Design a binder for this molecule. Structure first.
Ligand SMILES: N[C@@H](Cc1c[nH]c2ccccc12)C(=O)O
Ligand SMILES: N[C@@H](Cc1c[nH]c2ccccc12)C(=O)O
Ligand SMILES: N[C@@H](Cc1c[nH]c2ccccc12)C(=O)O
Ligand SMILES: N[C@@H](Cc1c[nH]c2ccccc12)C(=O)O
Ligand SMILES: N[C@@H](Cc1c[nH]c2ccccc12)C(=O)O
Ligand SMILES: N[C@@H](Cc1c[nH]c2ccccc12)C(=O)O
Ligand SMILES: N[C@@H](Cc1c[nH]c2ccccc12)C(=O)O
Ligand SMILES: N[C@@H](Cc1c[nH]c2ccccc12)C(=O)O
Ligand SMILES: N[C@@H](Cc1c[nH]c2ccccc12)C(=O)O
Ligand SMILES: N[C@@H](Cc1c[nH]c2ccccc12)C(=O)O
Ligand SMILES: N[C@@H](Cc1c[nH]c2ccccc12)C(=O)O
Lengths: 67, 68, 67, 67, 68, 67, 67, 68, 67, 67, 67
């Protein structure tokens, strides 16, 4: 499955956390105002963290992260 | 399957419990106010605990965890 | 599948029962008031018992344990 | 698949019946008033019997056992 | 798949019929008034019969079996 | 998949027809008035015939066989 | 998947046509007035024809064959 | 998957088209007025053609073929 | 999965395009006025083109091609 | 999965992009006004572009490309 | 699974991110005004970024990226 994230303000970060015994950030994707990323869960990513002002859509609804 | 968690106050803990014969915390992710984590159940994680004020969405709807 | 459990009072116990020929508790997770656990059925867990005051959500609706 | 059972009064019994050519009770789980159990069908359990006053939820709706 | 059976009178019988070339009763579970059984179709059971007054729920809705 | 058949009169027959190149009755289950059978299609049964007054429930609705 | 067929009159025929390179009737089930047959598609049957006055239910609704 | 076809007039044909590199008619099933056929897609049939006056039902609704 | 095409006028063509590295017409089925074809995607067909006045039904609704 | 595309004007192109490490046009199908193409994703095509004035249907709803 | 993207202004980019331990842009697809791309998640693409004004449709509904 995947998540849809739209940056509402500049410098939002979409961060992938490692799948496995260890849980660490493997990548932080910077999103500028207005850009959208559609990101899956994958072999390497089993949790996604969102920081900054953004709108998130999933199967379960919408959620806004805040600055 | 996955859970969506938005921190409504600072220092919310998202805790992964170990899959298998033993049940112990293998990781606690700290969220500050306004941050969101989308987390799956996995080979290593078969239970997830939320401590602190947060809005939770799952297949089953919404659940609020309360202020610490 | 999984169950969502929210503790309404302090001292709620979420207990996992062993999958297999034998049925014993293998783990009791204590929840404080306001905490939420999302717990799957697994290789080792085929029944979950809730004791104490709590709100439960499953694929079939909501249920309350009391006291 | 699984069933959710809330005891509405004391000494509700949730009984697992053996999967296979033979059908006997392999376990009877005592449920006190206000407690909840969520139980799966499993390698060892292919029928579940509920005795006592209880609320039961399944994929097919709600049932109340009486007594 | 499974069936939900609630006995509405005493002595309701929930009968499992054998899967395979032969069709015979292999087990009859007796239910007293108010008791509930949730039973699956299995390797050994491919037809289930209810005799006696009962409410049945399946993937298809409700059916009542009548008083014996 | 399965069918739910309730006998509305005495002398209802639920007949299983053989799966394979040949099509023969292999079993006729006689149902008394008010009894209900829930019968699967199986390795040995690929068609089921109902004779006598009965109510049939499937995934597609309800059908009444007539006296 | 399966089809439900109810004979509205005497002399309804439910015919199975062969799966494979060839399309031949392999069996015709006679259905008398009021009788119901519930028949699957199988290894041997990949088309079913109904002749006579009858009511048919499928995944796609109802259809009436005429005498 | 399957399709349900009812003949509204005589001489409706239900035609199976061959699966594979070539596309030919392997068989035409004649349906007389009021008869109904329920026909699957199979190892041999990957398209179905209807000719004559008929009502067709599939997963996506109803379609009428018309003769002449 | 499949498409339903009904010719509303004479000389509609239903064309199968080849699955694989190359994309060419491998077959053009001519449909006269009033005829219907139900056609699958297959090992050999990964795109279907319709030319002429016709009504099309898919899982996603109806579309009309125009002559 | 597949996409349904109807040309509302002359000159619509339906373009397949290559699956794999590289992303290149492997085929451009020209659609004239009123014609429809139903196209799948396949071993060779993992993205499809539509250029010109056309009505598009997917599992997700309707979209209009502009001239 | 796939996403539908329509460019509403000129010079929109649809960017694929690499599946695997590393996260890089492997390709930017230029989408000019009014054009539509329907793009899958694949062996090589596990996240998609949109830069510029566009309408996005997914299994979850609509999202707009901004100018
Ligand atoms: N490394 C962890 C990451 C993770 C997924 N879901 C979680 C929930 C809580 C804590 C960590 C996680 C895992 O793959 O299991
Ligand atoms: N180690 C346990 C964790 C767990 C999941 N669900 C539970 C319910 C109750 C108690 C523990 C659990 C297991 O994998 O089975
Ligand atoms: N040890 C048992 C646990 C169990 C699951 N569901 C039950 C219902 C009733 C009694 C026991 C159970 C086994 O896995 O089956
Ligand atoms: N041992 C039986 C238990 C059972 C399941 N469903 C039933 C219905 C009727 C009677 C017995 C059963 C079995 O595995 O098949
Ligand atoms: N022994 C039979 C039992 C059965 C199942 N469904 C039926 C319907 C009708 C008659 C008998 C049956 C079988 O496995 O097929
Ligand atoms: N022996 C036939 C039984 C059957 C199933 N569906 C049918 C429809 C019509 C006639 C016979 C049948 C078979 O297995 O295919
Ligand atoms: N023997 C044919 C029977 C058939 C199924 N669907 C059809 C549609 C039209 C004509 C014949 C058929 C088959 O297995 O493919
Ligand atoms: N022989 C072709 C038949 C076919 C199926 N669907 C079609 C659509 C158009 C043209 C031909 C076809 C194949 O199996 O692919
Ligand atoms: N030969 C191509 C045909 C095709 C399918 N979908 C398309 C979309 C656009 C262009 C070509 C196609 C393939 O199998 O991939
Ligand atoms: N060659 C790429 C094509 C592609 C699919 N989805 C995309 C999204 C963005 C950019 C490129 C693509 C692949 O198979 O992965
Ligand atoms: N290379 C990463 C790309 C990715 C997918 N989803 C993500 C979410 C956050 C950060 C990176 C990603 C992966 O395959 O796992």
């Amino acid at each position: 499955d995947f998540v849809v994230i739209k940056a509402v303000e500049d410098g939002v970060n979409v961060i992938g956390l490692t799948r496995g015994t260890d849980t660490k950030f493997h990548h932080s994707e910077k999103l500028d105002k207005g850009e959208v990323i559609i990101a899956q869960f994958t072999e390497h990513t089993s949790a996604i963290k969102v920081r900054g002002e953004a709108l998130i859509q999933t199967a379960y609804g919408e959620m806004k992260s805040e600055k």
